[PDB]
């Protein structure tokens, strides 16, 4: 009955190989996705920085109360979005 | 070479494999959970960014209907184009970054 044993081994051994391969593949797929995520992060944040800069400058110019209030909203929003893009960068770095 | 020793040798190998199997299977369950949690975070980020981008797009568009100096209009048109570009980039890249 080492036919049970020797066969149980063969059975575990390929079972293990499958599990390990399946895990490594998931890992590499997550890493590839994280790489692109991180590579695109500058192109996401930079326009937001421009919007923050331009909004801030606009607040220095002659605005009506309605324009000013709208532009203050653009600015707080843009700042929020920039923070979140930074949290996205952090995510992409988690498995590092 | 005892009958016991021979068995010991085979059962041992079997037990070493079984232990590794348990470890590999635990690590699989963990990796599935980490993949799902990462997908959820990307979905949530996308959702959280969508509202303020739409605000920026919408307010810059409304602003362009009001009375602006030429310099102000160029700055606000640049805001609108930039915000359109980025809203789409963020959504596309977060989508592509999920693992299904």
């Amino acid at each position: 009955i080492l036919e049970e044993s020797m066969h149980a081994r063969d059975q575990l051994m390929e079972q293990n190989f499958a599990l390990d391969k399946a895990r490594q593949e998931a890992e590499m797929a997550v890493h590839a996705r994280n790489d692109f995520l991180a590579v695109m992060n500058h192109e996401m944040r930079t326009p937001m920085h421009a919007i923050i800069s331009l909004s801030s400058l606009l607040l220095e110019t002659e605005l009506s109360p309605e324009q000013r209030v709208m532009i203050e909203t653009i600015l707080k929003s843009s700042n929020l979005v920039a923070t979140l893009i930074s949290d996205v960068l952090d995510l992409s770095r988690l498995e590092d």
Side-chain angles (χ1 to χ4, degrees), chain A:
Chain A
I1 57 65
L2 282 60
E3 61 188 340
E4 182 67 26
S5 199
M6 279 161 61
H7 194 64
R9 299 151 71 179
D10 288 336
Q11 185 150 105
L12 290 160
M13 189 104 111
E14 284 151 33
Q15 209 173 305
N16 285 1
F17 178 90
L19 284 165
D20 197 41
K21 193 176 164 105
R23 206 191 59 256
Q24 265 178 320
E25 285 176 350
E27 281 163 15
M28 289 183 322
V30 169
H31 291 80
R33 284 159 175 75
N34 285 342
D35 285 350
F36 187 60
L37 194 49
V39 79
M40 295 309 294
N41 192 265
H42 190 271
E43 291 351 308
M44 296 183 175
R45 77 186 178 256
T46 298
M48 292 313 307
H49 291 169
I51 293 166
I52 293 167
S53 179
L54 290 174
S55 292
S56 296
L57 277 174
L58 281 163
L59 293 170
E60 298 177 5
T61 67
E62 276 193 28
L63 301 180
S64 68
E66 301 95 331
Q67 291 167 328
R68 179 163 298 282
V69 143
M70 278 192 282
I71 296 167
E72 288 171 337
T73 303
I74 293 169
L75 173 62
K76 71 186 190 192
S77 292
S78 292
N79 277 304
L80 166 63
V81 170
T83 308
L84 297 171
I85 294 173
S86 180
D87 293 341
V88 171
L89 186 55
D90 288 343
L91 181 73
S92 74
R93 287 169 178 182
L94 280 191
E95 292 81 18
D96 281 22

